[PDB]
Amino acid sequence: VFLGFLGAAGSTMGAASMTLTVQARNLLSGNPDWLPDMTVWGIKQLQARVLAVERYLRDQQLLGIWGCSGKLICCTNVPWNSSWSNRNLSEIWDNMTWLQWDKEISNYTQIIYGLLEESQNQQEKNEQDLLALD
Amino acid sequence: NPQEIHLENVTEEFNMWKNNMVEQMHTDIISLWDQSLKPCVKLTPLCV
């Protein structure tokens, strides 16, 4: 079910995964047309929609430095750690929201980015270079 | 068409007295007054 933009904010993470393109398509293009030339009021909203694309490109750089690159669902090779949210499957995807999920991960979220940027492409690329000659 | 989409099962904590939209609208109204009165007729010689 669609339910439009952010419709599954309180639904399960599994049901919320069914609407990734919906949340993705409405964040980048909130296009205001600034054809009228008004002096001091344009710089504020221009800075706003420029910092918007700066944050978007920061997220895209983070999603490119990883083995994942497709702006979609993707799998990695970094194992999940039992210290992070000691929960089984179906307990997460059927009785939890992405908000509470990021809240519980926020304690251990900072090292996961490092494990994804270094334990992967800093070694996966090097293995790709030393295993593509044969 | 105003895209008004109700989010079911969503309860969100609002606080109107710490909101920042009010500050934005206040500064915008102030700059509106200032930029509306800038190119008009000044009356400094009227102080007689």
């Epitope: 399960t12 049901a15 059927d94 009785n95 | 309860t11």
Partner: nanobody, 131 residues
């Protein structure tokens, strides 16, 4: 952190009726089904029925289709994740076989094959049908 509280102990006569409350706290009342199951020494435990505070969908046992009526109020949100609802149950045509401890409990999951399964149980409420 859902800490549910049921009603108090009451005494009734056969053929009369009695109403048992089921006040909740610490969790979203509309996010889970509310089960109701009894425990009588004459036939052991028997699942009485569940109800959905969100969609308003109830489901009883065919033996309790006529005498059990389960109602729910609307949840009172305390925080963005906490609400204090209430689930009442009225039982009529009291007989000698309906003497025991009754329970209401919280549903398991919000989606899947076992969504309504009782996880968090109340402390219980004992009823004695006697003249």
């Amino acid at each position: 952190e859902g800490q549910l509280v049921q009603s108090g102990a009451e005494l009734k006569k056969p053929g009369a009726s009695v109403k048992i409350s089921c006040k909740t706290s610490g969790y979203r009342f509309n996010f889970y089904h509310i089960n109701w199951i009894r425990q009588t020494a004459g036939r052991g435990p028997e699942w009485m029925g569940w109800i959905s505070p969100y969609s308003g969908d109830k489901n009883l046992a065919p033996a309790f289709q006529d005498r059990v009526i389960m109602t729910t109020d609307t949840e009172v949100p305390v925080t963005s994740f906490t609400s204090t609802g209430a689930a009442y149950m009225e039982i009529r045509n009291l007989k000698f076989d309906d003497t025991g401890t009754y329970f209401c409990a919280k549903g398991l999951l919000r989606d899947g094959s076992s969504t309504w399964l009782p996880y968090l149980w109340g402390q219980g409420t004992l009823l004695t049908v006697s003249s």
